[PDB]
Amino acid sequence: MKLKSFGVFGNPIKHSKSPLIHNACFLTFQKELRFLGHYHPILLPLESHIKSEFLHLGLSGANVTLPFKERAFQVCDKIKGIALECGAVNTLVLENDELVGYNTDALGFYLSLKYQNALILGAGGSAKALACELKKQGLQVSVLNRSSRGLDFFQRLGCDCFMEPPKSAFDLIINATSASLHNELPLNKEVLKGYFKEGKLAYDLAYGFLTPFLSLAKELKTPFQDGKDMLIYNAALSFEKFSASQIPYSKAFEVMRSVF
């Protein structure tokens, strides 16, 4: 078998379930793939260059997670698909000597939901892609952050940006900050209680522990969902491209969900 190497760039990265689900599909599909992929977590120094590292490790493909998604977008040779609108890349693919960037977050998230407006907490690559996705769906979208980071992007999108909590009800309250990953809240407890009383879904992109955000929603009887299904969907959409579009995402999905 011809071997191909893949990875996931993150910092931190060791918590990640991506290698598990990706390697399960590489093993299942090597027949139709006609190569065997192996997939590895990569702690990337903040000071490093993604493209250099991608080229240097000889990768055929990779995923990007926090905090590199907007940086991945900058250093690609070409951007394709809905990533052109998100200013972030979660998926990287070597195409005829070009580093090509995709973003599967918008679609993975969308697919993960079984809502008229949304409050998005956070402003990195994740929050951008969800904002993008929810605007397309015709939701009214508000973004709440601590600073003027990525404001320009959210305003060209047509979002309402806030730095102080809007006194307003939202169907969807979405945590796209890095807070849960550090086991803390993304917002003052009582503010967030306010939104949870009024909301129809508290959604956290972090996965596989009961985060402070989800825990508070749970204590209050608000419906809540962590990012495990989004994770499986993104990954399945990533694997589709890693298979240069031979394996549809729905087949990857079935295998990933089950290994997970």
Count of domains for the chain:
2
- At 25, which CATH number? 3.40.50.10860
Give yes or no: residues 227 and 255 share one domain. no
CB neighbour list of residue 260: distance below 8 Å, 6 or more residues apart: 17, 20, 21, 228, 231, 232
Give yes or no: residues 86 and 42 share one domain. yes
Domain with 221, as residue range(s), is 105-234
Give yes or no: residues 110 and 25 share one domain. no
Question: Residue 204's closest CA among 194, 215, 190?
Answer: 215
Residue tagged active-site, from 69, 128, 241, 251: 69
CB 238 within 8 A of CB 104: yes
- Give CA separation, 111 vs 13, 114, 229, in Å: 24, 8, 8
Q: Is 69 a catalytic residue?
A: yes
| Residue 245 burial (10 A CB sphere; 0-12, 13-18, 19+) | exposed
Question: Residue 101's closest CA among 88, 113, 92?
Answer: 92
Structure method: X-ray
Please state the separation of Cα 210 from the chain's center in Å. 18
Strand partners, 5: 38, 59
CA atoms of 238 and 187, how far apart (whole Å): 31
Question: Residue 58's closest CA among 28, 38, 83?
Answer: 38
Give yes or no: residues 189 and 250 share one domain. no
- What single-letter DSSP state applies at residue 77? S
Give yes or no: residues 50 and 86 share one domain. yes
183 Rama class: left (phi>0) / alpha (psi -120 to 50) / beta: left
Give yes or no: residues 213 and 240 share one domain. no
Q: 191 by DSSP, 3-state: which?
A: helix
CB 13 within 8 A of CB 66: no
CA atoms of 177 and 173, how far apart (whole Å): 12
Exposure on the CB side of residue 48, measured as CA atoms within 13 A: 16
Give yes or no: residues 258 and 218 share one domain. no
- Give CA separation, 89 vs 55, 101, 183, 259, in Å: 17, 6, 25, 25
